[PDB]
Motif scaffolding. Structure first.
Motif, short mmCIF file in Angstrom:
data_model
loop_
_atom_site.label_atom_id
_atom_site.label_comp_id
_atom_site.label_asym_id
_atom_site.label_seq_id
_atom_site.Cartn_x
_atom_site.Cartn_y
_atom_site.Cartn_z
N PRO A 134 0.83 -1.21 0.00
CA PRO A 134 0.00 0.00 0.00
C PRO A 134 0.86 1.25 0.00
CG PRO A 134 -0.70 -1.55 1.69
CD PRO A 134 0.62 -2.01 1.21
N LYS A 135 1.53 1.51 -1.12
CA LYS A 135 2.50 2.60 -1.17
C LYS A 135 1.82 3.93 -1.46
CE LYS A 135 4.42 3.72 -4.64
NZ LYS A 135 5.08 4.17 -5.89
N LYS A 136 1.16 4.04 -2.60
CA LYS A 136 0.48 5.26 -3.00
C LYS A 136 -1.01 5.07 -2.81
CE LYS A 136 -0.89 7.45 -7.28
NZ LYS A 136 -0.62 7.57 -8.74
N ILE A 137 -1.70 6.11 -2.35
CA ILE A 137 -3.14 6.06 -2.11
C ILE A 137 -3.78 7.27 -2.77
CG2 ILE A 137 -4.94 6.18 -0.36
CD1 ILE A 137 -3.37 4.52 1.46
N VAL A 138 -4.86 7.03 -3.52
CA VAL A 138 -5.65 8.09 -4.14
C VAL A 138 -7.01 8.14 -3.46
CG1 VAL A 138 -6.53 9.05 -6.25
CG2 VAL A 138 -4.46 7.67 -6.28
N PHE A 139 -7.35 9.29 -2.90
CA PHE A 139 -8.60 9.46 -2.19
C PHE A 139 -9.72 9.81 -3.15
CE2 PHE A 139 -5.15 11.06 0.47
CZ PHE A 139 -5.20 10.14 1.49
N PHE A 140 -10.95 9.52 -2.73
CA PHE A 140 -12.11 9.82 -3.55
C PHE A 140 -13.28 10.17 -2.65
CE2 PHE A 140 -9.76 7.31 -6.71
CZ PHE A 140 -9.73 8.27 -7.70
N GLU A 141 -14.18 10.97 -3.21
CA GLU A 141 -15.33 11.45 -2.45
C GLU A 141 -16.45 10.42 -2.42
OE1 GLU A 141 -14.66 13.96 -6.26
OE2 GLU A 141 -13.51 13.03 -4.64
N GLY A 142 -16.57 9.58 -3.44
CA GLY A 142 -17.63 8.59 -3.45
C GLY A 142 -17.30 7.38 -4.30
N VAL A 143 -18.09 6.33 -4.06
CA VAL A 143 -17.93 5.05 -4.75
C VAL A 143 -18.10 5.22 -6.25
CG1 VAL A 143 -18.52 2.62 -4.58
CG2 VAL A 143 -19.03 4.16 -2.68
N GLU A 144 -18.96 6.14 -6.66
CA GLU A 144 -19.18 6.39 -8.08
C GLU A 144 -17.93 6.97 -8.73
OE1 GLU A 144 -20.87 7.77 -5.62
OE2 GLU A 144 -22.89 6.92 -5.62
N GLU A 145 -17.28 7.92 -8.05
CA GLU A 145 -16.05 8.49 -8.59
C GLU A 145 -14.93 7.46 -8.59
OE1 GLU A 145 -17.89 9.98 -6.30
OE2 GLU A 145 -18.29 12.06 -6.87
N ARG A 146 -14.87 6.60 -7.56
CA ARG A 146 -13.85 5.55 -7.56
C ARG A 146 -14.07 4.57 -8.71
NH1 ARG A 146 -12.67 1.26 -2.65
NH2 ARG A 146 -14.39 -0.01 -3.47
N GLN A 147 -15.33 4.22 -8.99
CA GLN A 147 -15.62 3.34 -10.11
C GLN A 147 -15.31 4.01 -11.44
OE1 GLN A 147 -16.62 0.18 -10.41
NE2 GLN A 147 -16.63 -0.27 -8.21
N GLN A 148 -15.53 5.32 -11.54
CA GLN A 148 -15.09 6.07 -12.71
C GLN A 148 -13.58 5.98 -12.88
OE1 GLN A 148 -17.54 6.75 -14.83
NE2 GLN A 148 -18.42 5.84 -12.98
N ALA A 149 -12.85 6.07 -11.77
CA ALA A 149 -11.40 5.98 -11.83
C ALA A 149 -10.94 4.59 -12.24
CB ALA A 149 -10.80 6.34 -10.48
N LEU A 150 -11.63 3.55 -11.78
CA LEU A 150 -11.30 2.20 -12.22
C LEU A 150 -11.65 1.99 -13.69
CD1 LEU A 150 -10.03 -0.16 -10.60
CD2 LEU A 150 -10.83 1.70 -9.16
N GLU A 151 -12.70 2.65 -14.18
CA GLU A 151 -13.01 2.60 -15.60
C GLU A 151 -11.91 3.26 -16.43
OE1 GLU A 151 -16.66 4.42 -17.49
OE2 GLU A 151 -17.54 2.53 -16.81
N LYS A 152 -11.43 4.42 -15.97
CA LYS A 152 -10.28 5.05 -16.62
C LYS A 152 -9.04 4.17 -16.56
CE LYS A 152 -12.98 8.19 -17.34
NZ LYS A 152 -13.75 7.60 -16.21
N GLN A 153 -8.88 3.42 -15.47
CA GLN A 153 -7.73 2.54 -15.35
C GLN A 153 -7.81 1.37 -16.30
OE1 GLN A 153 -4.76 2.74 -14.09
NE2 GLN A 153 -4.53 0.76 -15.12
N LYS A 154 -8.99 0.75 -16.41
CA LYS A 154 -9.18 -0.36 -17.34
C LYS A 154 -9.05 0.10 -18.79
CE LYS A 154 -10.04 -3.72 -14.46
NZ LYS A 154 -9.49 -5.10 -14.54
N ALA A 155 -9.49 1.32 -19.08
CA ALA A 155 -9.29 1.88 -20.41
C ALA A 155 -7.87 2.41 -20.56
CB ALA A 155 -10.30 2.98 -20.68
#
Lengths: 230, 109, 226, 121, 237, 133, 54
Positions: B27-48
RNA sequence: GCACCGCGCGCAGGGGGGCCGGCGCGGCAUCUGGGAAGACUCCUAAGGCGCAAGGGAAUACCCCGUGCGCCGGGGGUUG
């Protein structure tokens, strides 16, 4: 005047307890025309947390929360009057570090940390003030430390022996309080009550009363009666 | 003792330089998020190979330098213990050849 | 245990060191003629009470506890009068207290000697102890670093002129100091003075005879003339 | 003053001096200001203890500079005479510096002691 | 060969076994603290083959937590050539000089330090570098340089104080712009010397969120230092 | 609503949303004398000349945000108008310092950053000679 | 409660969580509560609880 | 997808849960074990230790009686 009517109930949520309660009362301020304004009294509480919560008595809820990086708070007390506009809460906690909070103009923020005891297993379980600048903390390694608030130093370290009633070789000073004439009363875990003279910070009497551990004390206003509940 | 001290100083500077160069290579780097929807958006950007050769090489050089510094440190400590055993009075320190530790409670007056 | 104890020169009280260390040592005071507990004095240290001594008029007592602390604790008000610290002693081991014509409020014993475990023996003047307030860091009238190992036994003369202090762990560690000059006597003990491993010393009541007893179990006697 | 990481707790001072005496018996110790300076410059010093009762403080105030540059913990005990006859010298030492080795109970004690010094900070 | 890194104003020097970080030198032909520097020129000088135009100062990660974060994988530093940064903790003018190099001539750096010897270093570096102004004043008292410091874009913070969140909070309320930037370094050793450092960093980031920032990300500097965190966050957006 | 804004050069007043007036100053060591005079809150010719109007107090309002300066310029009796401290005048003072780029052609269509720099170096060297070497 | 953190392997993506204590009171720490309870009953054992019951 | 006369089967993962059981980390009044450990204590013995040489060897390990030192035991009348 002998009626004892319960006015107000403010309940907290699930899994919330209350350990300490300290009112702060300002001195009597005088108006321009000679009318008198009594102090504005506020209520603080700790909840086995790292937080001190100030409750709004009018709103019938909590007003502010304050949290410093330390241990969870176990005991706290207000600096008494000598200055006038500058009075501070002192809180002893589990890890030992005497944290010090400020309250001015209805604000509650973590000012600083006075000290921390060298041992990490030193846990602060009681606190009471001798004078305007001298704090007496009761510590679970059979210890009663007298710190000084201004420079944050360690005036002295009164101590108590083992308990010889059972095992568990540390005694625990569950409560301290201060007489008007400078002496310090201290209820401990042997069911004793120790009177310490405070001009030199030494013990001058040990009184064995209770069978199990003392839990709380109270002093007369003039300093003649001691109440000890255990 | 003076000669071993100088060699240890040199080896310490070289070990500092080599550990610095080896870290610079790789657990070296951590990115914070305001909500589960934004985190899922970030995972979508990661998969893309060459860096591995030079990393193993620098690692072997670092390990050799560490062994040399440890050897010189143990030698310097051994010579300080020889001084203590041969001092002009009863001086503590160092084991005997039988295993009992030399320990005197006299003050050096 | 009841091993270490001291009787007051008034002979009315006798003090026993309790075996309860826990960073702070206490000692009980017992009325002798009835052998009854009357009081309890407690000092804070690191292992407890190293040694102690009654005062010459027998009202208070001075307790030298390890981590270098010293408490003067009186009998009249039955609480601690004062606390000071021996100058840099990493831990007290033995103390003694003698002489005449001192501070009348602190019992009138003029000289106090404290021997640490480093071998260093400090000699303080108890008029200089007063700043009732006590100076927290008094300066010794003289610091002795003659003996090398841990100081075992210390005794003053009953006339307050001589001070004998001895360490046991070395063969023949014993020195003799005149007071109030605080000078070590240099012509005794010689290299062939058969002390041994000095375990106990005692001056006679008229201060004429010095008695020394070693760990082999023999007692020897020296007349002390001037 | 300038002695800001001061060790005032008597139990802390007793622990520090007991550790110094033990390391002195193990010869894992460097006594005096100049040998402290040399050990810290060569980077071997695991912990360094200064004395606050030096009459000119400037004769020891330089050590925290290199100590901050080399990230080694330093702590002020009160009495130079106490530090002296804790080392076993019968002279007043003002700066002692105790080093580390591969493995020792004193190495574990040094780790715990620098943890306590970090608590003091 | 020198390549531009993803962040604007910072460059990599690539070789057969190495990958160094570097910045464009504002003062050509001069270094500060005993730092290596590369000389290079843009292509178009074959018949001469002299490295005369650009000078690059080398940016060592073992002396700057900012260099540590940039190598650790910070996604942005919120500052570009042209920006305005307030530097809290100008530890003897090293990272301050490099961020002066980053922000360039149109960008401005305002350094803050309370130590007097690092203050000497900072003033004697500011003699040369003119895009940076020094303030030898305790950062907990921002109304002693409110006259000096205009409104800035990015706050960088490396100070060894327990109330570091309160210092950054008061400096952000008196100088940081709306939607501003904050790059803070946390030293768990100075905040709380016994707790787990993850817990300490969690408490600090919660204190910043209560202080009305918005924590974007957190990355720790532990191939480079020990128990040091770098938090990148935005102010009011 | 008189406000009192302190930059390295001078002051501005926005009583009547929009700015009303100003007071500029450039390139002196009297600027750092002014700097010490406001680091305490003492008398200042620029401050007094700003607060000098001739009619009366039409409204006893001067909004500042440091209470030391407030409770010093109360004691200054030359005009006997009174300040208020910053009762979270954060939006006000922060927004006008951020939006001072509109203030630039109003008083000084230039950049006084070089005077700001000189003031900074003067103050910093004054402190490093307070801790002399 | 609060959502657990998703790890893609190198970094950690997590949702910040502060919706628990709006204005009522903070939550009490169960470990500190049990610690104080243990210091209360160091080695004692309870008496039998009630009357006649399995 | 298999069966269109069906449950169930291989497979991708979205979410929460029993917080059932293990792992990691933290504390833990006590208890157990080890080290260190007070100098009244052990400090192996009336002798031991160290350094440099010399000889012998199971040849990694070791043993033994020359020159320097450091202690100790006994004995030991203001040298």
């Amino acid at each position: 005047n002998g009626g004892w009517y319960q006015e107000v109930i403010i309940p907290g949520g699930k899994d919330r307890s209350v350990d300490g309660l300290v009112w702060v009362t300002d001195p009597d301020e005088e108006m321009a025309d000679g009318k008198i304004i009594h102090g504005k009294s506020r209520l603080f509480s700790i909840g086995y947390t790292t937080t001190i919560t100030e409750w709004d008595l009018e709103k019938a809820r909590a007003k502010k929360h304050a949290s410093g990086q330390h241990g969870e708070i176990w005991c706290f007390g207000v600096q008494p009057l000598p200055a006038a506009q500058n009075r501070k809460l002192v809180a002893g906690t589990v890890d030992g570090n005497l944290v010090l909070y400020s309250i001015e103009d209805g604000d509650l923020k973590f000012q600083k940390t006075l000290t921390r005891t060298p041992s990490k297993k030193t846990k602060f379980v009681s606190i009471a003030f001798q004078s305007h600048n001298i704090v007496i903390v009761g510590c679970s390694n059979s210890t009663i430390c007298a710190y000084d608030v201004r420079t944050g130093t360690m005036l002295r370290q009164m101590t108590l022996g083992t308990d010889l009633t059972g095992g568990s070789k540390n005694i625990i000073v569950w409560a301290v309080k201060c007489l008007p004439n400078g002496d310090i009363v201290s209820g401990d875990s042997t069911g004793q009550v120790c009177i310490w003279d405070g001009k030199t910070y030494t013990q001058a009497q040990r009184i064995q009363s209770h069978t199990q551990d003392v839990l709380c004390l109270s002093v007369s206003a003039d300093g003649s009666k001691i109440i000890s509940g255990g | 003792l003076g000669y071993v001290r100088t060699m240890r100083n040199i080896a310490a500077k070289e070990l500092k330089e080599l550990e610095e160069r080896y870290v610079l290579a790789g657990p070296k780097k951590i990115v914070f998020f305001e909500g589960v929807e934004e985190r899922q958006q970030a995972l979508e950007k990661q998969k893309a190979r060459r860096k591995q050769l030079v990393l193993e090489k620098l690692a072997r050089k670092v390990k050799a330098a560490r062994k040399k510094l440890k050897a010189l440190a143990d030698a310097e400590y051994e010579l300080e213990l020889q001084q203590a055993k041969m001092a002009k009075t009863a001086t503590s320190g160092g084991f005997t050849k039988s295993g009992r530790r030399i320990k005197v409670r006299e003050r050096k007056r | 245990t009841m091993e270490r104890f001291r009787v007051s020169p008034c002979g009315r009280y006798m003090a026993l060191v309790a075996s309860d260390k826990k960073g702070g040592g206490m000692l009980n005071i017992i009325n002798v003629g009835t052998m009854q507990w009357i009081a309890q004095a407690r000092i804070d240290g690191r292992h407890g009470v190293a040694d102690f001594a009654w005062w010459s008029d027998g009202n208070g007592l001075t307790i030298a506890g390890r981590d270098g602390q010293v408490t003067e604790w009186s009998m009249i008000t039955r609480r601690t009068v004062g606390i000071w610290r021996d100058e840099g002693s990493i831990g007290g081991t033995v103390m003694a207290l003698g002489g005449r014509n001192g501070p009348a409020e602190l019992g009138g014993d003029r000289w106090v000697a404290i021997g640490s475990n480093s071998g260093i023996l400090n000699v303080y003047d108890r008029n200089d102890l007063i700043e009732i307030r006590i100076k927290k860091y008094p300066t010794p009238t003289r610091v002795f670093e003659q003996l090398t190992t841990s100081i075992s036994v210390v005794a003053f003369s009953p006339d307050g002129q001589l001070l004998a202090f001895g360490s046991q762990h070395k063969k023949d560690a014993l020195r003799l100091v005149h007071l109030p000059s605080c000078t070590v006597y240099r012509n005794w003990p010689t290299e062939q003075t058969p002390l041994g491993r000095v375990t106990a010393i005692a001056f006679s009541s008229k201060s004429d005879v010095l008695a020394v007893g070693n760990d082999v179990g023999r007692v020897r006697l020296w007349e002390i003339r001037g | 003053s300038a002695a800001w990481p001061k060790a005032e707790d008597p139990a802390l001072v007793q622990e520090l001096l007991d550790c110094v005496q033990q390391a002195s018996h193990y010869r894992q110790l460097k006594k005096g200001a100049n040998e402290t300076t040399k050990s810290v410059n060569r980077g071997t010093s695991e912990l360094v203890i200064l004395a606050a009762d030096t009459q000119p403080l400037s004769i020891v105030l330089h050590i925290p500079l290199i100590c901050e540059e080399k990230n080694v913990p330093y702590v002020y005990v009160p009495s130079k005479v106490a530090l002296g006859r804790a080392c076993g010298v019968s002279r007043a030492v003002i700066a002692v510096s105790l080093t580390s080795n591969e493995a020792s109970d004193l190495n574990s004690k040094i780790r715990a002691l620098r943890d306590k010094v970090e608590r003091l900070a | 060969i020198v390549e531009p890194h993803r962040h604007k104003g910072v460059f990599v020097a690539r070789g057969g076994k190495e990958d160094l970080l570097c910045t464009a030198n504002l003062v050509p032909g001069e270094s500060v603290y005993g730092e290596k520097r590369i000389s290079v020129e843009t292509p178009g000088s074959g018949p001469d083959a002299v490295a005369t135009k650009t000078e690059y100062r080398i940016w060592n990660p073992f002396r700057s937590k900012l260099a540590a974060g940039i190598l650790g994988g910070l996604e942005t530093i919120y500052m570009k050539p042209g920006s305005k940064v307030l530097y809290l903790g100008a530890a003897s003018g090293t990272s301050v000089s490099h961020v002066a190099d980053i922000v360039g001539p149109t960008g401005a750096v305002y350094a803050v330090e309370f130590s007097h010897r690092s203050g000497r270093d900072l003033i004697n570096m500011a003699t040369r570098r003119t895009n940076v102004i020094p303030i030898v004043e305790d950062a907990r008292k921002p109304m002693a340089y409110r006259m000096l410091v205009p409104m800035v874009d990015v706050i960088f913070a490396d100070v060894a104080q327990p109330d570091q969140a309160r210092i950054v909070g008061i400096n952000a309320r008196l100088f940081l712009k709306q939607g501003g930037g904050l790059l803070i370094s946390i030293k768990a050793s100075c905040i709380d010397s016994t707790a787990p450092p993850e817990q300490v960093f969690a408490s600090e980031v919660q204190k910043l969120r209560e202080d009305k920032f918005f924590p974007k990300e957190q990355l720790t500097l532990e191939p480079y230092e020990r128990d040091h965190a770098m938090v990148s966050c935005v102010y009011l957006q | 609503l008189f406000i009192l804004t302190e930059t390295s050069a001078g002051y501005a007043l926005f009583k009547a949303i929009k700015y009303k007036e100003f007071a500029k100053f450039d390139s002196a060591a009297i600027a750092v004398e002014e700097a010490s005079g406001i680091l305490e809150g003492k008398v200042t010719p620029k401050l007094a000349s700003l607060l000098n109007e001739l009619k009366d107090e039409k409204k006893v309002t001067l909004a500042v945000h440091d209470t030391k300066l407030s409770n010093s310029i109360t004691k200054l009796p030359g005009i006997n108008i009174k300040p208020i401290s910053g009762s979270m005048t954060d939006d006000l003072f922060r927004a006008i310092r951020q939006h001072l780029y509109n203030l630039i052609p109003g008083m000084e269509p230039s950049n006084f950053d070089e005077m700001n720099l000189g003031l900074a170096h003067s103050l910093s060297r004054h402190k490093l000679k307070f801790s002399p070497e | 409660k609060n959502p657990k953190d998703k790890r893609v392997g190198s970094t950690a993506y997590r949702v910040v969580s502060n919706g628990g204590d709006p204005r009522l009171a903070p939550k009490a720490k169960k470990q500190s509560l049990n610690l104080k309870q243990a210091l209360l009953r160091r080695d004692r054992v309870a008496k039998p609880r009630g009357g006649f019951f399995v």
